[PDB]
Design a protein around this ligand. Structure first.
Ligand code: NAG
Ligand code: NAG
Lengths: 65, 65
């Protein structure tokens, strides 16, 4: 194999099933799994945005960069 | 032997490697290797990841960016 930079294995055993915390969420940009309890989920806005006290919504920019 | 573990889903395994122009794929049926190429139009594959929910393969290319 001349240039084997990456390798992956594809079986049903390598991606074990688990319940999804994010399915219950409704935040407007991203939902990410989180080790913190009890929600086990958190929401993330695009790079440069803020996150409102309303943890499911985001605000954008309004400051020089 | 009461110590070894095996997979319920068939033992058949799919192994994918990234080598420049080819996303080499190996299919281990029984212990016989079967080798074929997933895609013709790729330039320089670096990173390979597998998604079991859609049944898809993801790869990144150094030349195509
Ligand atoms: C979020 O808003 C505050 C003003 O309330 C601002 O100072 C801050 O820079 C914004 N986000 C970041 C971390 O840039
Ligand atoms: C691997 O090879 C077997 C036999 O050719 C085939 O039935 C199977 O679909 C191939 N792919 C996977 C993921 O098992």
């Amino acid at each position: 194999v001349p240039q084997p930079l990456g390798i992956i294995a594809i079986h049903p055993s390598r991606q074990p099933s688990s319940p999804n915390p994010c399915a219950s969420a409704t935040c407007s940009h991203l939902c990410l799994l989180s080790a913190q309890e009890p929600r086990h989920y958190s929401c993330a806005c695009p790079s440069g945005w803020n996150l409102s006290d309303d943890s499911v919504n985001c605000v954008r920019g309004d400051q020089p960069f | 032997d009461g110590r070894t573990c095996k997979v319920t889903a068939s033992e058949n395994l799919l192994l994918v490697v990234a080598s420049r122009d080819k996303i080499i794929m190996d299919n281990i049926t029984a212990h016989t290797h079967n080798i074929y190429s997933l895609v013709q139009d790729v330039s320089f594959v670096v990173a390979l990841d597998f998604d079991s929910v859609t049944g898809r393969v993801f790869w990144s290319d150094l030349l195509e960016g």
